[PDB]
Amino acid sequence: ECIENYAKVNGIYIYYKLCKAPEEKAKLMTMHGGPGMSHDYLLSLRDMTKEGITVLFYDQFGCGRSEEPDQSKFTIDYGVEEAEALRSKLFGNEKVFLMGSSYGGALALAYAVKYQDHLKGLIVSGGLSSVPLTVKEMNRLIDELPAKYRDAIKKYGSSGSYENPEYQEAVNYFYHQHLLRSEDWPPEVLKSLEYAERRNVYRIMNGPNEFTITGTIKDWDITDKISAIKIPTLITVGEYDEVTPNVARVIHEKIAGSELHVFRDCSHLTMWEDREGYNKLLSDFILKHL
């Protein structure tokens, strides 16, 4: 098993899990999405330890097993400083790789803008540089949904009746369509989803659900700042990703030399839909930029 700890990072206790590889060729830090999820759904990335890649997992502020700071700190800027404090505490001055998923991808991009000197490479999976853009794209996904679910989401969503059974059913369909497709949801994914509903960060920073971003990050957009990132960057996105390839395209065009990969038949949690292929792509990227 990996090493689990509860350390004080920037004033609050943060839970982390460090899965070391027998031969530490590289260190990979990971940022779960949400905002307000947990590291659990990214556990399939542990497979990379077999390739000499040490993987660091952690529950961000107010998420999963970590303590919640004052709401005034519920910001991506605070998340960035938290990540850097954790990196330094565990790895000192060693350069590491950083991977982010969904909101975690936006957080990783923000991190790179200020701390890319501490990185050998950046990986963004189903990430975004603009929340407004992400919302625009998900709205199109709702429209392309079969009338039954599309109609329920538009109707009850317009009145804010998120408790309605038909709405809940529509939400579930969307998730099985753009979050994790044609796959039995593993416990690790169920756990992160549960942590989302149990803690407060998801409700406050994000909103009711994935496609309903009413939270404090609704207007967030650093598209005009990511061009500053000049380190090797790998961008992945699923064909049916809830955070669409168009959103990924915008990141790709701003980051010079970045590589973009659209996983056909997959959606957001590509690390579960094509676990082997996903881990193989990331490990290849990492082993080429040591």
Outline the secondary-structure elements.
Layout lengths: L2 E7 L2 E8 L6 E6 L21 E6 L17 H16 L4 E6 L1 H13 L3 E7 L5 H13 L3 H13 L5 H14 L8 H12 L2 H6 L26 E6 L6 H10 L4 E5 L6 H4 L1 H13 L3
Parallel strand pairs: 3-4, 3-5, 5-6, 6-7, 7-8
Antiparallel strand pairs: 1-2, 2-4
Helix pairs in contact: 1-2, 4-5
PDB class: hydrolase
Keywords: alpha-beta hydrolase, hydrolase
Assembly: monomeric
Going by CATH, the architecture would be 3-Layer(aba) Sandwich
| Broad CATH class | Alpha Beta
Shape: globular
Give the biggest sheet. 8 strands, mixed
Tell me the span between the first and last alpha carbons.
26 Å
Number of helices: 10
Helical proportion? Answer: 25-40%
Report the structural category: alpha/beta
Order of helices and strands: EEEEHEHEHHHHHEHEHH
- And the CATH topology? Rossmann fold
How many DSSP E strands? 8
- Strand residues, percent: 15-25%
Folded structure, characterized:
- The protein has 290 residues and is an alpha/beta fold.
- It has one domain (1-290): Alpha/Beta hydrolase fold, catalytic domain (Rossmann fold, 3-Layer(aba) Sandwich).
- Helix content is 39%, strand content 18%.
- It has helices spanning 76-91, 103-115, 131-143, 147-159, 165-178, 187-198, 201-206, 245-254, 270-273, 275-287; strands at residues 3-9, 12-19, 26-31, 53-58, 96-101, 119-125, 233-238, 259-263.
- An eight-stranded mixed beta sheet has the order 1-2-4-3-5-6-7-8.
